[PDB]
Structures are given as structure tokens and as C-alpha cells.
């Protein structure tokens, strides 16, 4: 499972894809497993599965409401050890509902929270920081 962690990627936001599948920019549509809260747009963060559309990339891949896992976040969130973490940008991965990415590599460091939650993401990761 995953503990409470700061949400900072609400719907109607543009978020960058960091794999080799050819996708470049990702548009958030909806968030999996969100409660029925009143007047609160669901958000996303590292290790969270959300519904997103590929804005730019390969034409066949885009125009599909597909699950996406965020791997990088600008917002500063606290890790349970007590240290606050923030990244230079927001990065995500192109993944099927089963939990498998079409791409075969990732770019740059990878949050361990995303890596530990999804074991095959750690398999594709080469730099876990």
C-alpha cells in the first residue's frame, strides 16, 4: 500500500512523459479510486494511477483514455522519514491497467515510492532516487 502523500496534480493539467514509447505530453482526465467528495477536483502524484490522454506523440497511441502513473512531482511532499522531497518537473509513465509499460526504459532518477509500489516499474528503472 501507500501512505498519505501530498496531492498536487489536479485535473486539467499537462504533464510530461519520460519513457521511450514516443509520448511527450500527457493530459490528465480523471483519477482512479477517488472518493465522492463535494467540489474537490481529484489530484495525482507519484505512484498514483490516473486516466490521461497523450497530447503529443505517436498518433496511434494517443486519443485513448489510458491509465497513467506519475513518477515525478514539482510539489514538496514529506516522506515518512521526515524529509521533504520535490523534483524539477512532473513526469509520468505510459502503462496498461495490468501494470505494464509499452516503453522499455525510463529517463532520469526515479522516486522509490513509485518504484516500490510497482515492482516492474523498478524493473524498468535504472536510477532510483
Amino acid at each position: 500500500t501507500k501512505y498519505r502523500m501530498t496531492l498536487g496534480l489536479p485535473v486539467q493539467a499537462i504533464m510530461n512523459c519520460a519513457d521511450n514509447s514516443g509520448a511527450k505530453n500527457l493530459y490528465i482526465v480523471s483519477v482512479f479510486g477517488t472518493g465522492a467528495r463535494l467540489n474537490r477536483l481529484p489530484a495525482a502524484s507519484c505512484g498514483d494511477m490516473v486516466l490521461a490522454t497523450v497530447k503529443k506523440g505517436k498518433p496511434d497511441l494517443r486519443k485513448k483514455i489510458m491509465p497513467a502513473i506519475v513518477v515525478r512531482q514539482r510539489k514538496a511532499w514529506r516522506r515518512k522519514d521526515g524529509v521533504y522531497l520535490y523534483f524539477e518537473d512532473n513526469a509520468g509513465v505510459i502503462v496498461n491497467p495490468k501494470g505494464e509499460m509499452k516503453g522499455s526504459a525510463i529517463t532520469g532518477p526515479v522516486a522509490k515510492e513509485c518504484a516500490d509500489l510497482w515492482p516492474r516499474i523498478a524493473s524498468n528503472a535504472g536510477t532510483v532516487v
Binding site: 500500500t1 515518512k80 522519514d81 521526515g82
Partner: protein, 334 residues
């Protein structure tokens, strides 16, 4: 809106927390206390191993915010008797000690110095003249009454507070027969009861106090009682080795550098509580043993602190003690 139960949102009628619910008596158990009242000084954060079975964070390192509450030992000054009646608990009689601490005398007087200090004067003489009368009253307590509470007061002199009035309150004595409680109360007259008597560095306590005031419905200054809130450590500041975590050694004192914000320097027995507590700093708080009996793993697990932080809470402090500070900083002109 908020909870309907907590209505009305009126300011508390008591400055200090009142324990309305007390643990059920058990004559099979030995005589023991149930409630404590200390003073909230401030808070810090500590580093602690998290030995939670089955959790994902099992046997590893976690950071937990803690609160520091100074608890100087009280002085038992009297006992009261209570009779179970068709109208509820009724106060039968009350017996006190001889030499009341001078702070207690401040409680009875709104203008102590102007008053002629006539409180309990004739009671003192009548005790020295004939202890038979007191013995008769204690006979009344041990024979007729069913619930016994001892009169205890905070001993504020050794605390670093401008206030000089002792906070008087009653603590249930649960365990043993009625005569056993009275005899325990009698043998504890005029003496001090330490915090280590009731809490054992890992126990299930309920912190009570009046929350802080945000000003104007009313917003703030209500009575509150928090549950759970496990204890992390019952320090003994009289020992110079009070904080002194075994993992880190690093000889230190609980008092943060420059003193606690708006409180001062903690010197006496203090209790470490996880999370937060109702009420702002330098306010009297009340603790009590948890009413219910729950063996949940979050309430039964042992705690062995790894490292506590004694940095400068005033501003963005970054130094634990001057001993470790001086050699890091270049030798200044002073």
C-alpha cells in the same frame, strides 16, 4: 457545520481541565492512582524506530512530532469521601494535612497578601490538639464511603512560571478495600508523588485541557479531551542524564537551546507525548489513564527512542548543544 455533539460552542467555564470520567474501581487490584496534572511547555520532534508488526514500515526509522509537558511532583494535602446515593455521588466529608504548601493557600485567596492568611489556621490547631476527631472522620471515610479521592496540587515553585497559585484537584484511588485506600492516603499525607508512580514510559493516557483561543459564534477556549496519544518517555530532569538516548549518547538536556518558547527551561520530571495536545504553551494540562481496555498493537508495542532533537525552536535553529556547536563554528572573538 461542525459536529452537532460538541454544541454549544461556548467558552469553557473552567480555566483548567476537569476529569469527568474515571476508571472503574477494582478491589482485587492494588491501590493505585489514575490521574495526573502537569504543565505544557512546548514541543519538539524526535527520531524513533518504528517496530510495528505487519506494517510496511516494520523495523525501521520514523519521525514523530512530540510534545513536552513538565510534571513536577505534587503534594498530597488531603482526602475526600464520596457516597453512592440514589441522587449520585455525594461528598461525605474531607480531611486535610497539617502544613499546607504556601501555593495552596494562594488558591483559596484572591488577594493573598492583603488577607491575614487565616485559611485552615483553626483546622491546624484542632488537629494538633486532638487527632481523635480526625481519626473519627477517617473512620467515617473508611466505613461508609464507597469512592475515595485524594487532594493533590501542583507544586509550582520549582516550575519557571510567573503564576504562584497551586492548581488543586482530586485523583481517584482505585484498588483495594475502602480502608486500604484511606490508609494509603493517610501514609501519603504531606509527601510527594512522582510522575513515575502512575506512568511507566509506555502507557495509554488521555490528555485533557482547555484549547487555545482564536477570539470571536465563539472560536476557541473550549474544554477538550484527547484519547489515545501514547506516551514516548517520562524523563527525570533532576538527573543530568535525563534525555541521553542510548543510541546517540550525546549528553544533553530536554530543554531546547535558548529555552522553550515563552516557557523557559525545563528542569523537572517531564512527559513526552506523541502528536499534539489541547491547549497552548505554559497552560496546565490533565492526564488520566485510558478509560477503556484495548490491546491494539498501536497501544501495546514497546518504544525505545532513537534520537530526540534539542535544536533552537526559536527561529530556524540548527544546533543541538553548545558542546557540539562550538567546535563546528569558527572560534569567534568572544
Amino acid at each position: 457545520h461542525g459536529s452537532l455533539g460538541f454544541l454549544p460552542r461556548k467558552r469553557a467555564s473552567r480555566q483548567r481541565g476537569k476529569v469527568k470520567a474515571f476508571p472503574k474501581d477494582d478491589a482485587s487490584k492494588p491501590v493505585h492512582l489514575t490521574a495526573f496534572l502537569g504543565y505544557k511547555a512546548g514541543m519538539t520532534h524526535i527520531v524513533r524506530d518504528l517496530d510495528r508488526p505487519g506494517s510496511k514500515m516494520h523495523k525501521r526509522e520514523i519521525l514523530e512530532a512530540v510534545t513536552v509537558i513538565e510534571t513536577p511532583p505534587m503534594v498530597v494535602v488531603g482526602v475526600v469521601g464520596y457516597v453512592e446515593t440514589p441522587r449520585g455521588l455525594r461528598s461525605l466529608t474531607t480531611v486535610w494535612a497539617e502544613h499546607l504548601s504556601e501555593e495552596v493557600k494562594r488558591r483559596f485567596y484572591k488577594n493573598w497578601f492583603k488577607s491575614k492568611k487565616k485559611a485552615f489556621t483553626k483546622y491546624a490547631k484542632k488537629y494538633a490538639e486532638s487527632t481523635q476527631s480526625i481519626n473519627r472522620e477517617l473512620e467515617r471515610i473508611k466505613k461508609y464511603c464507597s469512592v475515595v479521592r485524594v487532594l493533590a496540587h501542583t507544586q509550582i515553585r520549582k516550575t519557571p512560571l510567573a503564576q504562584k497559585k497551586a492548581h488543586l484537584m482530586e485523583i481517584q484511588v482505585n484498588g483495594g478495600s475502602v480502608a486500604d485506600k484511606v490508609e494509603w492516603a493517610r501514609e501519603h499525607f504531606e509527601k510527594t508523588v512522582d510522575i513515575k508512580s502512575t506512568f511507566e514510559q509506555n502507557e495509554m493516557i488521555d490528555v485533557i485541557g482547555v484549547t487555545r483561543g482564536k477570539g470571536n459564534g465563539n472560536a476557541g477556549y473550549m474544554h477538550r479531551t484527547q484519547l489515545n496519544s501514547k506516551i514516548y518517555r517520562i524523563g527525570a530532569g533532576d538527573d543530568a542524564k535525563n534525555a541521553s538516548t542510548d543510541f546517540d549518547a550525546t549528553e544533553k538536556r530536554i530543554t531546547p537551546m535558548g529555552g522553550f518558547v515563552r516557557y523557559g527551561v525545563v528542569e523537572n520530571d517531564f512527559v513526552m507525548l506523541n502528536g499534539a495536545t489541547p491547549g497552548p504553551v505554559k497552560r496546565v494540562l490533565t492526564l488520566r489513564k485510558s478509560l477503556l481496555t484495548h490491546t491494539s498493537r498501536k497501544a501495546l508495542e514497546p518504544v525505545s527512542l532513537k534520537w530526540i532533537d534539542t535544536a533552537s525552536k526559536f527561529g530556524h535553529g540548527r544546533f543541538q548543544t553548545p558542546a557540539e556547536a562550538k567546535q563546528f563554528l569558527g572560534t569567534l572573538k568572544k
